[PDB]
């Protein structure tokens, strides 16, 4: 179906800046276009109906242009209360789609992470099961990628990631990855290593350890 | 398909 | 004033059916070409498109879910249903129903549709848990080691959520960052809960985990190993 695709997909910022993100669809849905904003825990609220007309009691530094395939959603003075997620939707063809999103946060400077790997503690390991956890600790800007690798393999299917709201005194965020494996599998190898790029590391730093040294 | 209101 | 609230069920085992009602006021869906659609939202993920309803009765719905779905309205109720069949884990989300304008008339003609390009107003969203799983407490285990040292406890398989941590039974803060918990293959969420401190500290640190929902309080003391 028709695609709507959002840049920028994410976006840092400071109060007072003008800020546009703009929306573009694979197929013209004239002007049936909507904007919205959404605060973290909150339903999303409508902004810009209809490409351009602005909803009654939003704030007047919110605009909204174009038709077609272009679109774009301007806050002239972001306000701290803008700092959110925004997202457009089409609803010229069913089923009405909504773009990916784009995040605006607080800017601040580049700050790499700080990177720490947990192994498996020995009570986890009587259960059978070996989890091994990797720490990226405030870093900015938000987007940050960790590579498992075990003596050299690349994993892939067996972590699950989470990381923290951007903090409200060092606008850093935070990432926790954890790889999950039998305690069989554990077993049978020795190198455990955790990859991080990200843009504050020149290059990719890696942190290991290697199961059972003592 | 096009929308309930669409031309 | 227009507002809307979904209610159902918080939480759903896999290949059940799920019912969501969406009661709303300051409208009637005998009202000229309204609408009220159902929006998903998986945690950390974009929205997603599902269904919507209009007062004379057309329906559409998404073409990924169309054979799971069906939306239903009772006008003398102000009541929008929407029924999911055969739900599996990525069916966990926050659901949402909306409000869609009708065109503007004038002595009721229609004279203006801009108005209908939009869902203008949202409810609170209710969040939907899909997982075979029952209630179950946490396994608490240790996570142990510019020049900052990091530690924490990894509060392992419970449902469903919530669970609280904190450090030193109140007294650690700074440094701190307890990660949002991932719902895991198995059905049971998983959680990380860290803190960072000055390399020379490693004073105790001991993080008091509670799970209400299995009755399940653990304080586990966390330290730089080596004996």
């Given at each position: 179906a028709l695609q709507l695709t959002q840049s920028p997909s994410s976006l840092s910022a400071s109060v007072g800046d003008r800020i546009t993100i703009t929306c573009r669809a694979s197929q013209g849905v004239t002007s049936a276009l909507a904007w919205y904003r959404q605060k973290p825990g909150s339903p999303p609220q409508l902004l810009?109906?209809?490409?351009s007309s602005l909803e009654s009691?939003?704030?007047?530094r919110f605009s909204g242009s174009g038709s077609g395939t272009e679109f774009t959603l301007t806050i002239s003075t972001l306000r701290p209360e803008d700092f959110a997620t925004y997202y457009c939707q089409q609803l010229?063809?069913?089923?009405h789609t909504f773009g990916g999103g784009t995040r605006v946060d607080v800017r601040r400077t580049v700050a790499a992470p700080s990177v720490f790997i947990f192994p498996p503690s020995d009570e986890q390991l009587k259960s059978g099961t070996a989890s091994v956890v990797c720490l990226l600790n405030?870093?900015?800007?938000r987007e940050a990628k960790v590579q498992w690798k075990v003596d050299n393999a690349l994993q892939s299917g067996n972590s699950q990631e989470s990381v923290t709201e951007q903090?409200?005194?060092?606008?850093t965020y935070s990432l926790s990855s954890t790889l999950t494996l039998s305690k069989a599998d554990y077993e049978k190898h020795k190198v455990y290593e955790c990859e991080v790029t990200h843009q504050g590391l020149s290059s990719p730093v890696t942190k290991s350890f290697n199961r059972g040294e003592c | 398909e096009l929308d309930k209101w669409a031309n | 004033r227009i507002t809307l609230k979904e209610s159902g069920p918080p939480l759903v085992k896999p290949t059940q059916t799920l019912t969501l009602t969406c009661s709303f006021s300051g409208?009637?869906?005998?009202?000229?070409?309204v609408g009220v659609g159902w929006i998903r939202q998986p945690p950390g993920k974009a929205l997603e498109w599902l269904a919507i309803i209009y007062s004379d009765d057309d329906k559409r719905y998404s073409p990924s879910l169309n054979t799971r779905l069906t939306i239903t309205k009772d006008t003398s109720k102000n009541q929008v249903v929407l029924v999911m069949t055969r739900?599996?884990?990525?069916?966990?989300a926050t659901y949402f129903c909306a409000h869609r304008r009708g065109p503007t008339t004038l002595f009721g003609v229609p004279?203006?549709?801009?108005?209908?390009?939009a869902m203008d107003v949202w409810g609170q969203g209710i969040t939907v848990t899909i997982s075979s799983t029952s209630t179950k407490g946490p396994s608490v285990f240790p996570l142990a080691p510019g020049a900052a040292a990091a530690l924490g406890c990894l509060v392992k398989d419970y449902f469903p959520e919530p669970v609280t941590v904190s450090w030193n039974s109140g007294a650690l803060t700074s440094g701190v960052h307890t990660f949002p918990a991932v719902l895991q293959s198995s059905g049971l969420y998983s959680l990380s809960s860290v803190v960072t401190v000055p390399?020379?500290?490693?004073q105790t640190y001991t993080c008091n985990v509670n799970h209400k929902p299995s009755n399940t309080k653990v304080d586990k003391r966390v330290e730089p190993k080596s004996c």
């Open positions: 810009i109906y209809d490409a009691g939003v704030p007047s010229h063809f069913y089923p405030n870093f900015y800007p903090d409200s005194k060092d606008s | - | 409208f009637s869906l005998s009202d000229f070409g739900v599996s884990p990525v069916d966990t004279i203006a549709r801009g108005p209908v390009n390399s020379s500290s490693l």
